[PDB]
């Protein structure tokens, strides 16, 4: 649990002078909040006969599978997981400010487009008083940005070297591939039927050091589940538990169509 | 018995209301028992934009050309005049495009971030944002408001003055504070005025 400063109400206005008295302003709030964690476990059974006389080992393969599945599922839940028995994904709460672009008409068809105007406008539309805030998107959409052309035919970025290589990160760009990559593969920017999709998420940009948190308590544990083993089988049990939660969904903005 | 401490919370809230109310009053204060806000002073040199036409349907509009003209049209003999505007205006400007597709500023860098100190421009996010909030009212059609404060520029060292007399004082109101209740009182002493509304231009729609 933890406190949450809601606001600081108005206390003193600018008074007249025929008042030896004064005026009472209402206070703010402290708005206490709570939160919990979430579990993650499972089992499997092997056949001692198959396990022993086998081509080679299967166990360490299963242990590595456990660790990788745990990591990837944790990440995907942190991204999009619901509040029900899981940490609520910040992308799903729909309380982060999410904007969308107007669909450029194509002689009769208002059509989705991630026009470079919209991107540059978004990245520069963020209160700098919150400090710096990094942006995240898929590699495919980034490469799509690198391939934008004018009415003439020249590139819009790095004209004359056939590679944009924009020196990322150094400006707020952190590329991941867990995001829903509005470019389906690389086949969504199609001005014709291939249009990028009514209301699809494009990118994000937030000050994540205070916009979202992840709590970690329990690492992975693996026990030999005695009681399920029958001298013909073996059953292992595992588990780990942790959680996550949004800080305040006003320190980050989201893109859509 | 409180779980929290209301005292320091109230002190901080009072100082915050002091600062923010002083700025908002110094900007738009309505004269009576408060400094007259130089925005509402309404003697400060102002200039509207031009009814740009599109689809034979004129619409209020605004271009970087008009902005540069407004900047350079200052009577330099007055002295150096700092300019101020909302950040959304800076976004609108850094996102201007030619008839070809090229950015009018910082072409091929995904941004446009000069140091706004030699550029002689400053941002106040509560200076009335010309855009109806960012973007929503921005431009083209069903947007771009009208006869609205776009930006300001002045030799503020002689355009507006602020007078300070006494900082914040706080004390327990002895009268009325029984053994069952307790009450505190506070105050300060500030003010301001306009020097001479002939040292700066205003850009309006």
């Amino acid at each position: 649990t933890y406190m949450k400063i809601a606001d600081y109400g108005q206390l003193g206005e600018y008074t007249c002078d025929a008042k030896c008295d004064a005026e009472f302003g209402e206070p703010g709030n402290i708005r206490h909040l709570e939160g919990k964690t979430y579990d993650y476990r499972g089992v499997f059974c092997f056949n001692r006969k198959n396990l022993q006389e086998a081509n080679y080992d299967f166990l360490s393969f299963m242990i590595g599978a456990a660790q990788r599945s745990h990591r990837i599922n944790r990440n995907q839940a942190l991204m999009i997981g619901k509040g029900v028995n899981e940490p609520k994904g910040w992308l799903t709460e729909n309380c982060f400010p999410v904007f969308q672009t107007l669909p450029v008409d194509v002689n009769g068809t208002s059509t989705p487009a991630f026009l470079a105007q919209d991107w540059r406008r978004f990245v520069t539309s963020f209160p700098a008083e919150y400090g710096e805030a990094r942006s995240v998107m898929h590699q495919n959409v980034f490469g799509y940005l690198a391939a934008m052309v004018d009415a003439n035919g020249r590139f819009l970025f790095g004209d004359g070297d056939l590679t944009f290589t924009p020196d990322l990160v150094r400006e707020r760009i952190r590329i991941s591939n867990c995001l829903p990559d509005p470019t389906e593969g690389n086949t969504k920017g199609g001005t014709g039927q291939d249009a990028f999709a009514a209301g699809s998420f494009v990118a994000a940009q937030a000050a994540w050091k205070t916009a979202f948190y992840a709590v970690e308590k329990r690492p992975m544990f693996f026990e030999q589940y005695e009681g399920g083993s029958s001298a013909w089988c073996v059953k292992y049990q595992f588990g780990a538990e942790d959680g996550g939660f949004v800080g305040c969904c006003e320190h980050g903005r989201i893109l859509q169509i | 018995e409180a779980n929290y401490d209301f005292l320091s919370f109230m002190i901080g809230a009072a100082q915050r209301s002091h600062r923010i109310n002083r700025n908002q009053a110094l900007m738009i204060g309505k004269g009576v028992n408060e400094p007259k806000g130089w925005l509402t002073e309404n003697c400060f040199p102002v200039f509207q934009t031009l009814p740009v036409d599109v689809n034979g349907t004129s619409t209020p509009a605004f271009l970087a050309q008009d902005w540069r003209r407004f900047v350079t049209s200052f009577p330099a003999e007055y002295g150096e005049a700092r300019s101020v505007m909302h950040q959304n205006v800076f976004g609108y400007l850094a996102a201007m495009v030619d008839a070809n597709g090229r950015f009018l500023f910082g072409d091929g860098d995904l941004t446009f971030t000069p140091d706004l100190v030699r550029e002689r421009i400053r941002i106040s996010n509560c200076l009335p944002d010309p855009t109806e909030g960012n973007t929503k009212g921005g431009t083209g059609q069903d947007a771009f408001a009208a006869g609205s404060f776009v930006a300001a520029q002045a030799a503020w060292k002689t355009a507006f003055y602020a007078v300070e007399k006494r900082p914040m004082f706080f004390e327990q109101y002895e009268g009325g504070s029984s053994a069952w209740c307790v009450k505190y009182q506070f105050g300060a002493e500030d003010g301001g005025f306009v020097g001479c509304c002939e040292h700066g231009r205003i850009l309006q729609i």
Binding site: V104, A147, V149, N186, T187, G189 | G140
Partner: peptide
């Protein structure tokens, strides 16, 4: 029971259409 592994052969290919930003049309 029966694990029923398959291992298809044909392997018939892919058709990524590698689309890219169209030409800048004026907004409005």
């Amino acid at each position: 029971m029966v694990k029923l592994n398959c291992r298809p052969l044909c392997q018939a290919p892919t058709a990524s259409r590698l689309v890219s930003p169209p030409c800048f049309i004026c907004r409005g």
